[PDB]
mmCIF file of C-alpha atoms in Angstrom:
data_model
loop_
_atom_site.group_PDB
_atom_site.id
_atom_site.type_symbol
_atom_site.label_atom_id
_atom_site.label_comp_id
_atom_site.label_asym_id
_atom_site.label_seq_id
_atom_site.Cartn_x
_atom_site.Cartn_y
_atom_site.Cartn_z
ATOM 1 C CA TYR A 1 50.491 -19.091 48.946
ATOM 2 C CA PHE A 2 51.713 -22.756 49.045
ATOM 3 C CA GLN A 3 49.785 -25.616 50.625
ATOM 4 C CA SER A 4 50.764 -26.706 54.110
ATOM 5 C CA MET A 5 51.718 -30.308 54.051
ATOM 6 C CA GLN A 6 49.915 -30.833 57.460
ATOM 7 C CA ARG A 7 47.368 -33.654 57.507
ATOM 8 C CA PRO A 8 43.938 -32.302 58.479
ATOM 9 C CA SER A 9 41.867 -34.192 61.002
ATOM 10 C CA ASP A 10 39.139 -35.803 59.049
ATOM 11 C CA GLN A 11 36.645 -35.017 61.810
ATOM 12 C CA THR A 12 34.096 -32.486 60.489
ATOM 13 C CA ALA A 13 31.346 -30.783 62.462
ATOM 14 C CA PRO A 14 28.619 -31.492 63.340
ATOM 15 C CA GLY A 15 29.470 -35.179 63.128
ATOM 16 C CA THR A 16 26.880 -37.823 63.659
ATOM 17 C CA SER A 17 24.374 -38.791 66.298
ATOM 18 C CA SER A 18 26.829 -41.474 67.391
ATOM 19 C CA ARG A 19 29.923 -39.231 67.274
ATOM 20 C CA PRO A 20 29.284 -35.543 67.526
ATOM 21 C CA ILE A 21 32.063 -33.228 66.424
ATOM 22 C CA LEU A 22 32.422 -29.619 67.564
ATOM 23 C CA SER A 23 32.843 -26.679 65.264
ATOM 24 C CA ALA A 24 35.808 -24.375 65.744
ATOM 25 C CA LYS A 25 33.548 -21.791 67.282
ATOM 26 C CA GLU A 26 32.085 -24.235 69.709
ATOM 27 C CA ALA A 27 35.512 -25.606 70.609
ATOM 28 C CA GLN A 28 36.737 -22.190 71.772
ATOM 29 C CA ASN A 29 34.662 -22.667 74.951
ATOM 30 C CA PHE A 30 36.501 -25.937 75.715
ATOM 31 C CA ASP A 31 39.989 -25.141 76.758
ATOM 32 C CA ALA A 32 41.811 -25.279 79.983
ATOM 33 C CA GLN A 33 41.056 -21.670 80.897
ATOM 34 C CA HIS A 34 37.318 -22.325 80.734
ATOM 35 C CA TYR A 35 37.536 -25.586 82.611
ATOM 36 C CA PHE A 36 39.580 -23.852 85.265
ATOM 37 C CA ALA A 37 37.470 -20.715 85.575
ATOM 38 C CA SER A 38 36.920 -19.229 89.067
ATOM 39 C CA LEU A 39 33.402 -18.672 90.481
ATOM 40 C CA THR A 40 33.969 -15.335 92.182
ATOM 41 C CA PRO A 41 33.910 -12.240 89.952
ATOM 42 C CA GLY A 42 37.179 -10.209 89.990
ATOM 43 C CA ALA A 43 38.857 -13.643 89.833
ATOM 44 C CA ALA A 44 41.178 -15.082 87.216
ATOM 45 C CA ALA A 45 41.016 -18.719 86.145
ATOM 46 C CA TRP A 46 43.440 -21.108 87.782
ATOM 47 C CA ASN A 47 46.707 -21.081 85.856
ATOM 48 C CA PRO A 48 48.942 -23.337 87.785
ATOM 49 C CA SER A 49 52.675 -23.043 87.651
ATOM 50 C CA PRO A 50 54.461 -26.347 87.228
ATOM 51 C CA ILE A 51 55.494 -28.394 90.168
ATOM 52 C CA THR A 52 58.841 -27.183 91.512
ATOM 53 C CA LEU A 53 60.963 -29.331 93.718
ATOM 54 C CA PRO A 54 62.860 -27.888 96.669
ATOM 55 C CA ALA A 55 66.548 -28.253 97.207
ATOM 56 C CA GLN A 56 65.696 -30.193 100.358
ATOM 57 C CA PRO A 57 62.512 -32.040 101.081
ATOM 58 C CA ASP A 58 60.623 -31.753 104.346
ATOM 59 C CA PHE A 59 60.234 -35.508 104.656
ATOM 60 C CA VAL A 60 61.809 -38.543 103.059
ATOM 61 C CA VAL A 61 60.131 -41.950 102.792
ATOM 62 C CA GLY A 62 62.372 -44.892 102.188
ATOM 63 C CA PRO A 63 63.707 -48.171 103.479
ATOM 64 C CA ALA A 64 64.533 -48.342 107.157
ATOM 65 C CA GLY A 65 68.111 -47.384 108.042
ATOM 66 C CA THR A 66 68.845 -45.640 104.723
ATOM 67 C CA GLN A 67 70.512 -42.255 105.008
ATOM 68 C CA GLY A 68 68.180 -39.298 105.162
ATOM 69 C CA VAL A 69 64.991 -41.369 105.484
ATOM 70 C CA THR A 70 62.544 -39.863 107.981
ATOM 71 C CA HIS A 71 59.670 -42.355 107.598
ATOM 72 C CA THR A 72 59.109 -45.876 106.250
ATOM 73 C CA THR A 73 55.504 -45.475 105.165
ATOM 74 C CA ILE A 74 53.955 -42.753 103.140
ATOM 75 C CA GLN A 75 51.029 -42.312 105.485
ATOM 76 C CA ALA A 76 53.408 -41.620 108.361
ATOM 77 C CA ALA A 77 55.125 -38.852 106.436
ATOM 78 C CA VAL A 78 51.777 -37.354 105.372
ATOM 79 C CA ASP A 79 50.703 -37.384 108.998
ATOM 80 C CA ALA A 80 53.906 -35.679 110.036
ATOM 81 C CA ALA A 81 53.253 -32.986 107.458
ATOM 82 C CA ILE A 82 49.631 -32.487 108.487
ATOM 83 C CA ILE A 83 50.260 -32.219 112.258
ATOM 84 C CA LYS A 84 52.325 -29.055 111.656
ATOM 85 C CA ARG A 85 49.105 -27.139 110.813
ATOM 86 C CA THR A 86 50.939 -24.920 108.418
ATOM 87 C CA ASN A 87 49.820 -22.864 105.380
ATOM 88 C CA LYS A 88 53.144 -23.485 103.697
ATOM 89 C CA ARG A 89 53.514 -26.213 101.125
ATOM 90 C CA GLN A 90 55.321 -29.355 102.322
ATOM 91 C CA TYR A 91 57.333 -31.679 100.197
ATOM 92 C CA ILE A 92 57.604 -35.416 100.760
ATOM 93 C CA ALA A 93 60.207 -37.279 98.700
ATOM 94 C CA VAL A 94 59.690 -40.998 98.194
ATOM 95 C CA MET A 95 62.728 -43.198 97.456
ATOM 96 C CA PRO A 96 62.540 -46.008 94.931
ATOM 97 C CA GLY A 97 60.652 -49.003 96.328
ATOM 98 C CA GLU A 98 57.335 -50.698 96.753
ATOM 99 C CA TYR A 99 55.044 -49.220 99.380
ATOM 100 C CA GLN A 100 52.052 -51.413 100.231
ATOM 101 C CA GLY A 101 49.083 -49.695 101.877
ATOM 102 C CA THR A 102 46.653 -46.868 101.575
ATOM 103 C CA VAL A 103 47.692 -43.189 101.588
ATOM 104 C CA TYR A 104 44.973 -40.806 102.767
ATOM 105 C CA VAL A 105 45.827 -37.098 102.454
ATOM 106 C CA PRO A 106 43.370 -34.976 104.408
ATOM 107 C CA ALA A 107 42.053 -31.542 103.839
ATOM 108 C CA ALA A 108 44.534 -29.121 105.392
ATOM 109 C CA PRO A 109 45.381 -25.447 105.214
ATOM 110 C CA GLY A 110 48.576 -26.131 103.316
ATOM 111 C CA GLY A 111 49.352 -28.112 100.144
ATOM 112 C CA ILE A 112 51.209 -31.385 100.135
ATOM 113 C CA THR A 113 53.652 -32.358 97.330
ATOM 114 C CA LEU A 114 54.558 -36.034 97.101
ATOM 115 C CA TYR A 115 57.176 -37.030 94.580
ATOM 116 C CA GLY A 116 59.252 -39.966 93.594
ATOM 117 C CA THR A 117 62.985 -39.839 93.274
ATOM 118 C CA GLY A 118 63.450 -42.761 90.891
ATOM 119 C CA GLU A 119 64.661 -42.460 87.221
ATOM 120 C CA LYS A 120 61.146 -43.352 86.086
ATOM 121 C CA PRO A 121 57.688 -43.166 87.652
ATOM 122 C CA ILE A 122 57.554 -46.943 87.841
ATOM 123 C CA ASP A 123 60.425 -46.902 90.322
ATOM 124 C CA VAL A 124 58.183 -45.755 93.215
ATOM 125 C CA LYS A 125 55.092 -48.037 93.498
ATOM 126 C CA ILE A 126 52.226 -47.330 95.861
ATOM 127 C CA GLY A 127 49.648 -50.096 95.933
ATOM 128 C CA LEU A 128 47.073 -52.189 97.716
ATOM 129 C CA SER A 129 44.225 -54.494 96.482
ATOM 130 C CA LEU A 130 40.799 -53.164 97.379
ATOM 131 C CA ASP A 131 37.464 -54.019 95.763
ATOM 132 C CA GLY A 132 34.220 -52.070 96.253
ATOM 133 C CA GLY A 133 32.493 -55.381 96.627
ATOM 134 C CA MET A 134 34.538 -56.438 99.630
ATOM 135 C CA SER A 135 33.098 -56.702 103.092
ATOM 136 C CA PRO A 136 33.761 -53.945 105.590
ATOM 137 C CA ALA A 137 35.499 -56.388 107.867
ATOM 138 C CA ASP A 138 37.921 -57.491 105.115
ATOM 139 C CA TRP A 139 38.395 -53.817 104.179
ATOM 140 C CA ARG A 140 39.247 -52.799 107.716
ATOM 141 C CA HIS A 141 41.747 -55.601 108.018
ATOM 142 C CA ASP A 142 43.533 -54.750 104.778
ATOM 143 C CA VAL A 143 43.483 -50.944 105.188
ATOM 144 C CA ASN A 144 44.218 -50.704 108.929
ATOM 145 C CA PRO A 145 46.860 -52.947 110.324
ATOM 146 C CA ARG A 146 48.570 -52.059 113.597
ATOM 147 C CA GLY A 147 46.713 -48.796 114.270
ATOM 148 C CA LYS A 148 47.641 -47.031 111.088
ATOM 149 C CA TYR A 149 44.387 -45.087 111.464
ATOM 150 C CA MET A 150 43.211 -44.173 114.933
ATOM 151 C CA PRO A 151 41.175 -41.310 116.357
ATOM 152 C CA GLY A 152 43.563 -38.458 116.775
ATOM 153 C CA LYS A 153 45.765 -39.373 113.881
ATOM 154 C CA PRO A 154 45.366 -37.415 110.672
ATOM 155 C CA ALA A 155 42.943 -38.804 108.176
ATOM 156 C CA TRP A 156 40.773 -40.400 110.833
ATOM 157 C CA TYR A 157 37.689 -38.686 109.484
ATOM 158 C CA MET A 158 38.419 -40.296 106.057
ATOM 159 C CA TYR A 159 38.976 -43.789 107.431
ATOM 160 C CA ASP A 160 36.013 -43.536 109.809
ATOM 161 C CA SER A 161 33.580 -42.616 107.029
ATOM 162 C CA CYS A 162 34.298 -45.970 105.443
ATOM 163 C CA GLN A 163 34.973 -48.209 108.420
ATOM 164 C CA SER A 164 31.654 -47.428 110.074
ATOM 165 C CA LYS A 165 29.673 -48.917 107.170
ATOM 166 C CA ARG A 166 27.551 -51.906 108.013
ATOM 167 C CA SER A 167 26.474 -52.601 104.434
ATOM 168 C CA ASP A 168 27.353 -55.879 102.729
ATOM 169 C CA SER A 169 30.002 -54.171 100.581
ATOM 170 C CA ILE A 170 32.195 -51.147 101.208
ATOM 171 C CA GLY A 171 31.575 -49.467 97.809
ATOM 172 C CA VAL A 172 33.622 -47.708 95.113
ATOM 173 C CA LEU A 173 34.045 -44.535 97.186
ATOM 174 C CA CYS A 174 36.028 -46.545 99.757
ATOM 175 C CA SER A 175 38.073 -48.674 97.372
ATOM 176 C CA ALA A 176 40.823 -46.116 96.717
ATOM 177 C CA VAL A 177 44.474 -46.883 97.446
ATOM 178 C CA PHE A 178 45.420 -43.192 97.376
ATOM 179 C CA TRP A 179 42.674 -40.794 98.476
ATOM 180 C CA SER A 180 43.235 -37.102 98.804
ATOM 181 C CA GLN A 181 41.032 -34.302 99.967
ATOM 182 C CA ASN A 182 43.984 -31.871 100.109
ATOM 183 C CA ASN A 183 43.545 -28.692 98.095
ATOM 184 C CA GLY A 184 46.736 -28.115 96.333
ATOM 185 C CA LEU A 185 47.965 -31.709 96.250
ATOM 186 C CA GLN A 186 50.809 -32.193 93.828
ATOM 187 C CA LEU A 187 51.928 -35.692 92.700
ATOM 188 C CA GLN A 188 54.946 -36.285 90.509
ATOM 189 C CA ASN A 189 57.134 -39.163 89.314
ATOM 190 C CA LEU A 190 55.461 -42.127 90.979
ATOM 191 C CA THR A 191 53.064 -45.015 90.351
ATOM 192 C CA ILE A 192 49.763 -45.600 92.107
ATOM 193 C CA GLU A 193 48.104 -49.002 91.497
ATOM 194 C CA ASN A 194 45.054 -50.828 92.783
ATOM 195 C CA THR A 195 46.654 -54.213 92.558
ATOM 196 C CA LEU A 196 43.326 -56.160 92.419
ATOM 197 C CA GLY A 197 44.134 -56.442 88.749
ATOM 198 C CA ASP A 198 43.296 -59.713 87.082
ATOM 199 C CA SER A 199 42.547 -61.537 90.345
ATOM 200 C CA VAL A 200 38.867 -60.995 89.721
ATOM 201 C CA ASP A 201 36.474 -61.703 86.878
ATOM 202 C CA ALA A 202 34.929 -59.523 84.136
ATOM 203 C CA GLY A 203 32.022 -58.304 86.295
ATOM 204 C CA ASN A 204 31.601 -55.264 88.516
ATOM 205 C CA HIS A 205 34.742 -54.805 90.590
ATOM 206 C CA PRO A 206 35.377 -51.140 91.334
ATOM 207 C CA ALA A 207 38.928 -50.751 92.448
ATOM 208 C CA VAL A 208 40.138 -47.188 92.523
ATOM 209 C CA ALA A 209 43.833 -46.450 92.328
ATOM 210 C CA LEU A 210 43.746 -42.644 92.887
ATOM 211 C CA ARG A 211 40.824 -40.628 94.210
ATOM 212 C CA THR A 212 41.143 -36.882 94.425
ATOM 213 C CA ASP A 213 38.540 -34.491 95.903
ATOM 214 C CA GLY A 214 40.732 -31.378 96.366
ATOM 215 C CA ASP A 215 40.778 -28.189 94.264
ATOM 216 C CA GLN A 216 43.879 -27.009 92.474
ATOM 217 C CA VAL A 217 45.399 -30.494 92.237
ATOM 218 C CA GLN A 218 48.343 -31.155 89.903
ATOM 219 C CA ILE A 219 49.414 -34.650 88.849
ATOM 220 C CA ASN A 220 52.500 -34.709 86.616
ATOM 221 C CA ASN A 221 54.432 -37.709 85.203
ATOM 222 C CA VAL A 222 52.459 -40.253 87.242
ATOM 223 C CA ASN A 223 51.341 -43.747 86.295
ATOM 224 C CA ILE A 224 47.840 -44.599 87.522
ATOM 225 C CA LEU A 225 47.214 -48.292 87.109
ATOM 226 C CA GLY A 226 44.017 -50.234 87.490
ATOM 227 C CA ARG A 227 41.155 -51.980 85.749
ATOM 228 C CA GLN A 228 37.679 -50.695 86.757
ATOM 229 C CA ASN A 229 37.466 -47.097 87.988
ATOM 230 C CA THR A 230 41.227 -46.451 88.046
ATOM 231 C CA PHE A 231 41.079 -42.673 88.543
ATOM 232 C CA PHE A 232 38.089 -41.154 90.397
ATOM 233 C CA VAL A 233 37.507 -37.500 90.991
ATOM 234 C CA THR A 234 34.843 -36.277 93.297
ATOM 235 C CA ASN A 235 33.571 -33.087 94.803
ATOM 236 C CA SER A 236 33.032 -34.586 98.227
ATOM 237 C CA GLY A 237 33.586 -32.776 101.466
ATOM 238 C CA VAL A 238 34.077 -34.480 104.800
ATOM 239 C CA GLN A 239 30.892 -36.598 104.413
ATOM 240 C CA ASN A 240 32.408 -38.836 101.675
ATOM 241 C CA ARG A 241 29.696 -38.548 99.021
ATOM 242 C CA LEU A 242 29.143 -36.613 95.826
ATOM 243 C CA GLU A 243 27.865 -33.061 96.463
ATOM 244 C CA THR A 244 25.863 -30.532 94.467
ATOM 245 C CA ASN A 245 27.714 -27.230 94.942
ATOM 246 C CA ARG A 246 31.483 -27.604 94.651
ATOM 247 C CA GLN A 247 33.616 -27.707 91.509
ATOM 248 C CA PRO A 248 37.197 -28.947 92.176
ATOM 249 C CA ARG A 249 39.748 -28.405 89.450
ATOM 250 C CA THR A 250 42.512 -30.898 88.597
ATOM 251 C CA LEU A 251 45.302 -30.788 86.011
ATOM 252 C CA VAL A 252 46.858 -34.122 84.927
ATOM 253 C CA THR A 253 49.878 -33.759 82.653
ATOM 254 C CA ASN A 254 52.430 -36.064 81.078
ATOM 255 C CA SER A 255 50.847 -39.121 82.732
ATOM 256 C CA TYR A 256 49.829 -42.672 81.922
ATOM 257 C CA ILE A 257 46.458 -44.089 82.979
ATOM 258 C CA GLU A 258 45.512 -47.748 82.405
ATOM 259 C CA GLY A 259 42.291 -49.619 82.975
ATOM 260 C CA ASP A 260 39.278 -51.134 81.315
ATOM 261 C CA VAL A 261 35.802 -50.047 82.502
ATOM 262 C CA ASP A 262 35.308 -46.398 83.438
ATOM 263 C CA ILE A 263 38.984 -45.698 83.664
ATOM 264 C CA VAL A 264 38.479 -41.976 84.533
ATOM 265 C CA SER A 265 35.277 -41.365 86.481
ATOM 266 C CA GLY A 266 33.539 -38.803 88.541
ATOM 267 C CA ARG A 267 32.568 -35.262 89.289
ATOM 268 C CA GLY A 268 34.994 -32.369 88.941
ATOM 269 C CA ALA A 269 36.633 -30.315 86.272
ATOM 270 C CA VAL A 270 39.720 -32.212 85.075
ATOM 271 C CA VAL A 271 42.115 -31.297 82.267
ATOM 272 C CA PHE A 272 44.353 -34.078 80.882
ATOM 273 C CA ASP A 273 47.216 -32.757 78.753
ATOM 274 C CA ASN A 274 49.710 -35.066 77.057
ATOM 275 C CA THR A 275 48.379 -38.054 78.883
ATOM 276 C CA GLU A 276 48.278 -41.575 77.517
ATOM 277 C CA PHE A 277 45.205 -43.628 78.161
ATOM 278 C CA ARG A 278 45.544 -47.418 77.685
ATOM 279 C CA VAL A 279 42.697 -49.868 77.641
ATOM 280 C CA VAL A 280 43.708 -53.388 78.731
ATOM 281 C CA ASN A 281 41.733 -56.527 77.968
ATOM 282 C CA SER A 282 43.290 -58.964 80.476
ATOM 283 C CA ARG A 283 40.350 -58.852 82.899
ATOM 284 C CA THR A 284 37.486 -58.229 80.457
ATOM 285 C CA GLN A 285 37.256 -58.590 76.751
ATOM 286 C CA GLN A 286 33.614 -57.550 76.432
ATOM 287 C CA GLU A 287 33.662 -53.844 77.201
ATOM 288 C CA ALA A 288 35.833 -50.882 77.972
ATOM 289 C CA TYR A 289 35.117 -47.201 78.489
ATOM 290 C CA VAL A 290 37.732 -44.554 79.007
ATOM 291 C CA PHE A 291 35.715 -41.678 80.451
ATOM 292 C CA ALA A 292 32.715 -41.824 82.817
ATOM 293 C CA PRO A 293 31.966 -38.306 83.871
ATOM 294 C CA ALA A 294 29.305 -37.617 86.511
ATOM 295 C CA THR A 295 29.151 -33.895 85.814
ATOM 296 C CA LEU A 296 26.096 -32.099 87.211
ATOM 297 C CA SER A 297 23.690 -31.003 84.472
ATOM 298 C CA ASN A 298 23.874 -27.328 85.539
ATOM 299 C CA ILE A 299 27.719 -27.367 85.410
ATOM 300 C CA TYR A 300 29.294 -26.841 82.040
ATOM 301 C CA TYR A 301 32.725 -28.367 82.520
ATOM 302 C CA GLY A 302 33.619 -31.924 83.155
ATOM 303 C CA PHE A 303 36.593 -33.595 81.515
ATOM 304 C CA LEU A 304 38.920 -32.224 78.851
ATOM 305 C CA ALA A 305 41.523 -34.434 77.162
ATOM 306 C CA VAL A 306 43.897 -32.349 74.999
ATOM 307 C CA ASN A 307 46.937 -33.404 73.051
ATOM 308 C CA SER A 308 46.556 -36.916 74.520
ATOM 309 C CA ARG A 309 46.972 -40.506 73.159
ATOM 310 C CA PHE A 310 44.393 -43.277 73.380
ATOM 311 C CA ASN A 311 45.336 -46.943 72.792
ATOM 312 C CA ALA A 312 43.244 -50.123 73.079
ATOM 313 C CA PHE A 313 44.092 -53.833 72.532
ATOM 314 C CA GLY A 314 41.066 -55.846 71.229
ATOM 315 C CA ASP A 315 39.105 -55.697 67.984
ATOM 316 C CA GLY A 316 36.968 -52.551 68.145
ATOM 317 C CA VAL A 317 35.369 -53.260 71.510
ATOM 318 C CA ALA A 318 36.709 -50.284 73.477
ATOM 319 C CA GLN A 319 34.753 -47.070 73.693
ATOM 320 C CA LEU A 320 35.737 -43.497 74.625
ATOM 321 C CA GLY A 321 33.186 -43.204 77.353
ATOM 322 C CA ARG A 322 29.670 -43.226 78.835
ATOM 323 C CA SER A 323 27.903 -40.981 81.255
ATOM 324 C CA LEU A 324 27.955 -41.987 84.939
ATOM 325 C CA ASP A 325 24.318 -41.226 85.743
ATOM 326 C CA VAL A 326 24.616 -41.369 89.537
ATOM 327 C CA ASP A 327 21.634 -39.134 90.143
ATOM 328 C CA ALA A 328 18.885 -37.387 88.157
ATOM 329 C CA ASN A 329 20.746 -34.149 87.786
ATOM 330 C CA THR A 330 23.825 -35.653 86.096
ATOM 331 C CA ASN A 331 24.759 -35.418 82.390
ATOM 332 C CA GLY A 332 28.422 -36.198 82.113
ATOM 333 C CA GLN A 333 30.557 -33.866 80.122
ATOM 334 C CA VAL A 334 33.752 -34.651 78.170
ATOM 335 C CA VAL A 335 35.644 -33.165 75.292
ATOM 336 C CA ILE A 336 38.459 -35.002 73.562
ATOM 337 C CA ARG A 337 40.469 -32.645 71.380
ATOM 338 C CA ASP A 338 43.627 -32.546 69.424
ATOM 339 C CA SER A 339 44.330 -36.160 70.380
ATOM 340 C CA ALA A 340 45.525 -39.346 68.701
ATOM 341 C CA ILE A 341 42.962 -42.250 68.859
ATOM 342 C CA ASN A 342 44.704 -45.299 67.719
ATOM 343 C CA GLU A 343 43.687 -48.758 66.993
ATOM 344 C CA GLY A 344 41.261 -50.735 69.010
ATOM 345 C CA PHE A 345 38.292 -48.433 69.430
ATOM 346 C CA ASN A 346 34.696 -48.754 68.230
ATOM 347 C CA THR A 347 34.706 -46.028 65.624
ATOM 348 C CA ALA A 348 31.006 -46.368 64.713
ATOM 349 C CA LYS A 349 29.780 -46.044 68.299
ATOM 350 C CA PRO A 350 32.510 -44.499 70.399
ATOM 351 C CA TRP A 351 30.150 -43.506 73.186
ATOM 352 C CA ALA A 352 28.098 -46.041 75.118
ATOM 353 C CA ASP A 353 24.792 -45.824 76.929
ATOM 354 C CA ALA A 354 24.904 -44.490 80.502
ATOM 355 C CA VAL A 355 25.837 -46.607 83.439
ATOM 356 C CA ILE A 356 23.304 -46.951 86.280
ATOM 357 C CA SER A 357 20.452 -45.451 84.336
ATOM 358 C CA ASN A 358 21.022 -47.196 80.999
ATOM 359 C CA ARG A 359 20.091 -43.938 79.336
ATOM 360 C CA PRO A 360 20.705 -44.475 75.633
ATOM 361 C CA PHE A 361 23.541 -42.482 74.127
ATOM 362 C CA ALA A 362 22.177 -39.486 72.176
ATOM 363 C CA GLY A 363 24.477 -37.202 70.343
ATOM 364 C CA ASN A 364 23.264 -33.763 69.298
ATOM 365 C CA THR A 365 24.060 -32.848 65.724
ATOM 366 C CA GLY A 366 22.077 -29.622 65.967
ATOM 367 C CA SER A 367 20.776 -27.555 63.089
ATOM 368 C CA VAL A 368 21.962 -24.841 60.755
ATOM 369 C CA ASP A 369 20.554 -21.285 60.645
ATOM 370 C CA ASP A 370 21.200 -18.021 58.724
ATOM 371 C CA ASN A 371 24.277 -18.274 56.484
ATOM 372 C CA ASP A 372 24.939 -21.913 57.342
ATOM 373 C CA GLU A 373 26.330 -22.007 60.881
ATOM 374 C CA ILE A 374 25.845 -25.053 63.127
ATOM 375 C CA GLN A 375 23.627 -24.273 66.049
ATOM 376 C CA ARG A 376 23.085 -26.365 69.119
ATOM 377 C CA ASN A 377 22.846 -25.881 72.833
ATOM 378 C CA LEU A 378 25.861 -27.746 74.144
ATOM 379 C CA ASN A 379 24.245 -28.081 77.579
ATOM 380 C CA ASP A 380 20.870 -29.510 76.441
ATOM 381 C CA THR A 381 19.773 -32.158 78.904
ATOM 382 C CA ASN A 382 17.951 -34.057 76.154
ATOM 383 C CA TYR A 383 21.277 -35.141 74.748
ATOM 384 C CA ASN A 384 24.638 -36.277 76.006
ATOM 385 C CA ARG A 385 27.588 -33.900 76.381
ATOM 386 C CA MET A 386 30.399 -36.041 74.994
ATOM 387 C CA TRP A 387 32.268 -34.351 72.168
ATOM 388 C CA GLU A 388 35.310 -34.507 69.912
ATOM 389 C CA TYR A 389 37.294 -31.883 68.060
ATOM 390 C CA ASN A 390 40.293 -32.199 65.705
ATOM 391 C CA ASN A 391 41.349 -35.746 66.623
ATOM 392 C CA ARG A 392 43.574 -37.959 64.518
ATOM 393 C CA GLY A 393 44.519 -41.594 64.299
ATOM 394 C CA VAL A 394 42.752 -44.593 62.824
ATOM 395 C CA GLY A 395 40.247 -44.445 65.685
ATOM 396 C CA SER A 396 39.241 -40.890 64.744
ATOM 397 C CA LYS A 397 37.659 -41.865 61.438
#
């Protein structure tokens, strides 16, 4: 038997307290089928089929006067889809262009598919600048010009949950450009950006590009561009706050996600396959964290990054993640497997202390028992739940 010429990952279980590494046996519990498991018995895990585009879309968003365009804003087309009150999936094509303004996709009986028709995802750009620190008055002005959101239009309940706030600042959970609660949302071939970008300093400036709260959501060949809190998943219902008994599942494939601090955050089971994550250092050079899961401590599945690529600029500043300790019963969960970690990461301490609580990072290296098998409870609340398996690249060593 001749020797495979394949280069083995140099990551060997159990790893270290700073960088715990799963055994093969442990890693079998951390694949998409487990992350996507149903809760009913008699029920198969979610196995989504790929997004399929129709020969004709239901709605077309584009420049005014162009042939075949139905609507000039994306919110208007979403509203036209929602008012039908149908169980059937609706498809909204978006022509190449720049589309300034929020897009709120409400919970509905049927799924909405929104897709770009450009040669690349960058050809359709959806954006607005919104900062969690901004005043409600400034927020209302920027989000709702000319009666975009009014009682009796779709997505009112979403807008109203934010606009009613009388706090000094609107908060991260209202800073999203694109916010969906639609189960079954599908996004393909477009760019979603919170354009706050480098207009602000290195401090706390939550500015979500895409927020998704729906179950069975598929995002394919999308660019999600931001700085702090670029992509946020939550398990919220109509009250707009994190919940304790709902586990939405999202699949992100073939996508590009850029930011700096807590680039992918929140509560939900999310699988990232063949996604590139890029840390930028144009706004802050002092810190960067890719994943900030807020997974409930009784829930076993948070984030899974598989067959993905991680790139960072600076000199070993960037980290893979930190737990988002939003409440006492949170212990964020993430597995990064089979992925390339390239230059720019802190290889000695890839996981940071928790945000909000400042809970020190604690990796569980477990013990060995009879005939030399690593043993540890992967859901032990005394340790973090941030793990790697079979990664490669300079940043994997």
